[PDB]
Amino acid sequence: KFLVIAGMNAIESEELLLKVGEEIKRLSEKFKEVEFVFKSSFDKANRSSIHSFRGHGLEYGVKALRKVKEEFGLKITTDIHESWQAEPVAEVADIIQIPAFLCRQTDLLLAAAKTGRAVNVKKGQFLAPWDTKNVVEKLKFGGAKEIYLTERGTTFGYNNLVVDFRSLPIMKQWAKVIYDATHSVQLPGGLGGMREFIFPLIRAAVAVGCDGVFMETHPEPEKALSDASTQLPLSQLEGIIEAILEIREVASKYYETI
Amino acid sequence: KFLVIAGMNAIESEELLLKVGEEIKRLSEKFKEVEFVFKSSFDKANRSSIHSFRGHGLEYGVKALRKVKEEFGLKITTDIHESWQAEPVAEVADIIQIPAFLCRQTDLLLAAAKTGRAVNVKKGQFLAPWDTKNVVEKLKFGGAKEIYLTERGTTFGYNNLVVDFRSLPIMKQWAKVIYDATHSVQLPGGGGMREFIFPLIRAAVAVGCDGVFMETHPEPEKALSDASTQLPLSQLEGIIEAILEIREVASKYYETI
Amino acid sequence: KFLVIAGMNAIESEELLLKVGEEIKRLSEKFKEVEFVFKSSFDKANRSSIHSFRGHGLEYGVKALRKVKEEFGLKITTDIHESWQAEPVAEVADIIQIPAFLCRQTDLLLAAAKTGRAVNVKKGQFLAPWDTKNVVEKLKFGGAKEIYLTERGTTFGYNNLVVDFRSLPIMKQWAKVIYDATHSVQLPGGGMREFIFPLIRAAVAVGCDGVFMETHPEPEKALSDASTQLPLSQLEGIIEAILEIREVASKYYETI
Amino acid sequence: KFLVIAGMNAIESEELLLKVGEEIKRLSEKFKEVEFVFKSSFDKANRSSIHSFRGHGLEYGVKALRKVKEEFGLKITTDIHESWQAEPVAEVADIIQIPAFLCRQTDLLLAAAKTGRAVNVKKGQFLAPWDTKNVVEKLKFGGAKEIYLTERGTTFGYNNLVVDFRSLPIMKQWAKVIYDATHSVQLPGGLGMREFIFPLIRAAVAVGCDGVFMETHPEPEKALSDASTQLPLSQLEGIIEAILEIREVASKYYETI
């Protein structure tokens, strides 16, 4: 059954997070066949500017993600940045996310695999798809059983990303493949993304074949303290989920095996 | 009315051209809501090696095309390489094709636009999507009425191309878009990988395009150009049905330009 | 000796074409160690907009060139966009130039090789350094004797080119190499002139058989490639620099 | 005073390190106009394979680097991978190196700046040159006073890097610039090209930069990392000589940022 990873890019506030957690609960009720997982970063450890929003800290974040899980019965995924953050995070996160810039930091991957939780690894903007076989190999060595590789775009010149859809079938050979619909259309350092392309590339993803879609959402995308240009309006989620399910239905029959 | 441009990369032997030509005809008959067009090049004026198969001349070509156009009643399309080849070829081809490397050559375009026939420009591997607008403008200024833009991959480092599927909705702003499913999986001087041909076609119809461009051959390993990318004639039907199904569902979400 | 192809990007006029031929002449006299070659195009056959300047036809073209070739005694070179322009242009052009986008068009290559002239091929923005081998194999077959490969940048994402300086030694394995100092910094569909010089020093330091650069008396008033056109009054300086760097670096140029 | 950062990629063993340091010492004596800074990693924390050499631990690596500083009187530099590593490393490092994949990791940048030591950031392969400004601003925010940016290539298609030398003058506006002659010709996940190392250094000094970074090993074929890109310890002298020579004549043309 299809995996949908949704949430706010960052934990801007517990009030905002809970509101977003409500739409996902409602959505899981409407799409019984989809496996939903609530996502949110407790820290933007890689912002370009020292002036940008980062977060309220690990403690606060883990506590807020807990509220969402306890109040909505939703599984959780959040990203970690240094080794020591795995265990504490593993307390509430069902899936530990590894940032794209860190997909090669051996200790971080090992730390995460060691918690016993599932691990999703954002493919680096510098990584060739075949080069992800070693990422999985490390996680496996570290104890990881539920492994995920997430397509999030490849460096295409300066301040731009391209999604080479060949990566989906190649990566499926070693792990469940996920398509990150929001960061893939993001233009890095662009102000120091293009929301209109989010939906069309998602359809491409499911036509090609993947095991899940990752998409960030916000009640007021233009007021988002992070990834504003690319976060989707809460009201748009429903329509996109339906199209994924419909496109997957008629397409699955053609997904290449293995 | 989805447009499907299929055929042999080049005219190797009219016998094969007819074998592929009847197969198309059969399909055009099964899929009546589809408009087929027979594609094939009378010459390969852009091969890397000097020892590579080119063609049997514009004469033998234009002749072979009309032979298929009459024996099967299928619309024809082929590409021109120099300003002159326009007029002579517009006598058998309904769609004049402009090569990828020549998409910026003002006079070649200006010419094919005069023949009154429809024009299809392969987007250069060096062109950014939003740059195809000027290509359209040149042709309109030249009398082109039915204009087509074709996605065929972009230079992604050395000996490799990538398909930026954002180009489809972008070029759709000023022309009908075609997705080249065979040259896009091709590896420049590598090459190509037939294993990705179909998956990306699926991607193209899911995103939304006005048609696809494929190339088929009775048995690829025998092809004389782009052999590792040529699609086996048999599979051609399964694919056509596949993208029609996907198109039926996907079109409900195509953005409105 | 060292090659220095200079001149205007386009033949905006025979008047201006001369003001430039005069300066190239002077520099030609001040640096007897360098083989200068006047260059300009009679037709910008590949402009982006249909509304952009092209030239005054092959007529006024070869006309203006032949004039400089006799009034200043400088060798001349220009680019052809279709096979027929080969022999007719090979009347005044010592070096026939092949545009970047056309570098794989066999007939344009064979047609230039026929004329028995020197053929300089702009390496396409879509071509790998090593793929230029066949481009030289095509010219040999076509009767070419004096061949050149020009580095003019590689497609780097949308509307941008990067100069992979590894090509210089790679290509030098089968052809003399020229570096296009003005087009290698252009932004397809735009340009940054502040990088023209720096990259030239980089080209000679690595090692090349010659430099290719376009100049104009008043760049801001140019009708083609305004942004990437050295103001005539700077060519001399740059040329002194290329020689100096070439003298110190020569010693280190690898060996094919 | 031109800066030459040199040493062996990883601290393979203390003896092998002292051997390289002996040579670096010799060079600092012969080239008194150059400022040599010895470099070596106590840990390869980003190896593609779980089976590759990483190192003998921080403590071991800090002792070795200190033995090289003490015995040969050379300045030291090494890279850090997690915040906690900054402080202990600063006891010996004159310059704290920040890995390319980690160049956007704020807490690591801050941790290094807080030590009071100079900081040299490897420009990420996904970073445009103008994006480094925000990097230099994070460091100043953290207390860094002496800052360096190192050009080490940019992602060019898969398993390949290209060096855009327009990045030197661009980055010189915010920090002193070093050119990494070793990783720039490296082919990521390819298994580099040793023959291109010297040519690119020449281009680098010609264009203009405040220093060059080059790893060296006595027996490159037996290196436990970056084997294909480490220079034979016997070639360094030639390179440095040529560099000073090129810089000598080229220096006057460096454009005043």
Curated annotation (Swiss-Prot), chain C:
It holds the Pfam family DAHP_synth_1. Keywords: Cytoplasm, Lipopolysaccharide biosynthesis, Transferase. GO terms for cellular component: cytosol. InterPro entries: Aldolase_TIM, DAHP1/KDSA, KDO8P_synthase. The keyword Cytoplasm applies. Its main location: cytoplasm. It is an enzyme of class 2 (transferase). HAMAP family: KDO8P_synth (MF_00056). GO terms for biological process: keto-3-deoxy-D-manno-octulosonic acid biosynthetic process; monosaccharide biosynthetic process. The keyword Transferase applies. Pathway: Carbohydrate biosynthesis; 3-deoxy-D-manno-octulosonate biosynthesis; 3-deoxy-D-manno-octulosonate from D-ribulose 5-phosphate: step 2/3; Bacterial outer membrane biogenesis; lipopolysaccharide biosynthesis. Gene3D superfamilies: Aldolase class I. This is 2-dehydro-3-deoxyphosphooctonate aldolase. Belongs to the KdsA family.
